[PDB]
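Structure, all five chains, one model.
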Amino acid sequence: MPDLGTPIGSVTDSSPSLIRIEISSAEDFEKYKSMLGVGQYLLVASGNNLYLLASITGVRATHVNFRFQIDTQPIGTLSEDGEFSRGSHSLPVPTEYAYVTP
Amino acid sequence: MPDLGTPIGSVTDSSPSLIRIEISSAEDFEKYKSMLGVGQYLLVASGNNLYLLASITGVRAT
Amino acid sequence: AEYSIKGYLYQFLKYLSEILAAGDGARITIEGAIEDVDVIAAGLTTAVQCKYHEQAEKYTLGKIYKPILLMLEHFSKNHVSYRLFCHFPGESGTKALTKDDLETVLSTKGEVLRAIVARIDTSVDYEAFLDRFAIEFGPSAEDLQVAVLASLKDKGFDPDDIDAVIFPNAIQRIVDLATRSDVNDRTVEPKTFLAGLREVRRVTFTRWTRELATKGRMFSSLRKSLRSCLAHNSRWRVFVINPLTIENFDDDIVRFIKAFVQRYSSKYLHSNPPLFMLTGDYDLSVLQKRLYDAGLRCETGKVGGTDVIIKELFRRPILIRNPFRMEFSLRLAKRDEVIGGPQRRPDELFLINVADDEWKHEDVNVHGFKIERLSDLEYILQLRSDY
Amino acid sequence: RLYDAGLRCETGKVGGTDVIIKELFRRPILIRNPFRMEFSLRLAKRDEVIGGPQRRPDELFLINVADDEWKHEDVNVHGFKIERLSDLEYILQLRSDY
Amino acid sequence: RLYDAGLRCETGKVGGTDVIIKELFRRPILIRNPFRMEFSLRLAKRDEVIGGPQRRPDELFLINVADDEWKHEDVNVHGFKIERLSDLEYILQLRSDY
C-alpha cells in the first residue's frame, strides 16, 4: 500500500513460469543496482489494484543503444488491503510497469 | 448447447496431441482471464454439429 | 449549542420501534424541535427538543445539573414540550418535579451557571415549565439499537442486506419526515413503509447515519461490492451528480477528479476514459481551466461552442507508448444538453444525489448513493485509506 | 463546415472566451502505421492573440494587410495583393491555369 | 541573432580576444543517426586572424575587395562586384528569380 515510487521498466514477455522485463536507460540500472541482484523481489501490476510478487532468476546486458534484460518467476499476489494469495493466478499483460520492493 | 456466445479466436495449428489457439485483441483476454488459466476447459468446433473438449496446458503473450 | 444529536437519534429510534409495532391504521406523529428551522411551525407549534445523559448511578439533581439549567434558558426565550431521555439502573418511572426541587435547582453552586442563568428573564411561568416538561428514565441507546435490528429482521429480509442498506435508509426517511420545510404529515401508514422500503435499493451517507452504530459495516459491505468492477482495466463508466446540496463542491471536485484519473485513467491499456455529467445551471469553463492548470486535458465535445455532437464525445483516443501521451484523460458535459444515447451501452452508471435517468436499463448495473461530504465516496472507490 | 468536410482544427481554447498562446503553438501526436494526425490546421483571430511565439517564424505571407507586429528583419515577409481567391491557388502551386 | 535564428557558431576564441588558428579550422563532431552537428558556420574578423592555414582552400570567393594575401596560383580566386545581396543570392543558387 505504501508509495512504491517511480518504476524501472516495462514488461515484454509474460507466462506462468517466466516474466521478461526490459530497461531502456542505464542511469536507472546504475541507480537501482543493489536491489536487482539474484534473490531479491519485485512487484508487477496485474490490474488496477492488485500486484504480483516476483523473484529474480537472471540478469543480462547487451550493447547495440543498450538493452538490459531481467528474467523472473512468480510467487503470488498481494492486494491493497493486504491480502496475500498464493498461486500463479493472473498473468501480467505487456506494457505494465514494474516496481521495487520495500 | 446452449448459447455458447461470442468466441475468442481461431486455430493456427493442429494435431491429435496438441492444439494452438491464437488471440489478437486485448479486451477479450482481460475480460475472460479468469476462465483462461491452466486446468480449465474449452470447446473447439470440429464440424458443423460437433465439438471437441480441450484442457489448457500453456499460455504465452508477446 | 451541543445539539445532542444522539438525542434526536434516540427519539427517532423510539419512533421506529413504534412504527414497527404500530397497528394497522395507527400513524404515530412527530415534531422536529427548534433545531429544525420551520417558519410554518406545523403541528400546532408542538416541536419537541430533547437531550441525553448517562453514567449516573442513582438519581441526584447533582448528576442532572447541566441539562435542566440548559433547558431553562431555551424556555426563557419563549409549544416546546421539552422531553429528556435518560437511563438510571433500577429506576424506570416517570414523574413530574415539584416547586421545592425547582428552587433547589435555583440554588446555584457554580457561578458560571449563574452567569448563564442571568440571561434568563426572571418573569416566567415556572409552573407552566414544570407541567410542560417531563422526565423519562429509559433504556440504553445501544441495546435499543440491537433490539431494533432484531425487530427489523423479524419482519423478514435477506439477512445480509439489512445491515447496510435498510436500517439507515429507514432512519433517513423518518428524519426527512422530521425536518422538511416542504409540506408534510407526520402521520404515515406503517403498512406502506414496509413495502416502500422493500422497493428502493440505494444507500445513504448522511450526517445522522454517521453516528449510528451500524457504521463500520456500511462502508465495508460497499467496498466489497464494488471491488470486482473497478478491478478491470478497460470499461465504460459514467457519472451523474447534483451540486445543489453537496458540501464544499467547488473546492474539492477538482481533487476528486484528479485522484480518480491518477489511478484509473493514466496508463496505456486504459482505452476508454470516464465521463462526468453535472446537472443544474453550473458553469464548466472555470472547472476546465482549473483542471488544465494541473495537467489534465478534457474532451468537451463541442466543435463550435453552439451545441454538442453525440458522436465526437464518445470517440476513441490516440495512444502512444514510449513516452506516454494521452490526447484526453477525461470527458465533461451537462445533461440538459446531451441528447440521445450511445451505440454501445454502459457497464456502470453511478448516480450521486439523483433519482432516475434515461439511460437506465436492465443490462446496465446501476448503483446509487446519497452524500454530503465527497471525501466519504473516495473510501468506497479505494482512492484513499481511512475516513 | 470544415468539420463536415473531414478536417479537425485547433482554436487555442480551453472552453472560455480567451486564447492561450502555448497550446496555439504545439506539436501534434503523429502515428505512422496506420497514418493518423490530430490537428491539421489552426485558426484564430488576430485581435485575440496577444504575445509572440517562443520561436520566430520563417515565412509570413500577408494578403491585403499592410503592416503587422511580428514583422521583423530576420523573418521573410512575402507581402502580396489579390482581387479574388482563385488567384492565390495559382500562386501556391495548386491550380494550373490562371 | 544567429543563435536566436537556430544555428550555432565557432569563433576560435578561448575566453580572451585573441583568435587562435588551430581551434578555428578543426574538424567537427558528427553523428549519423540522428543528425547532430557541433557547429555549422564559422566567423572571424580579418584583422584578428593573422598567419596562414596548414591546408589550402579549394575555393576563395571575394566580395568587394581588391586583393588579399591568400591569393595564390593553385587556389581559385573568383571575384565580383555587387550592389545588394540579392544578386549574390542569385549567383549561388538560392533565388531562382533575379
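Helices of chain E lie at 2-5, 85-91.
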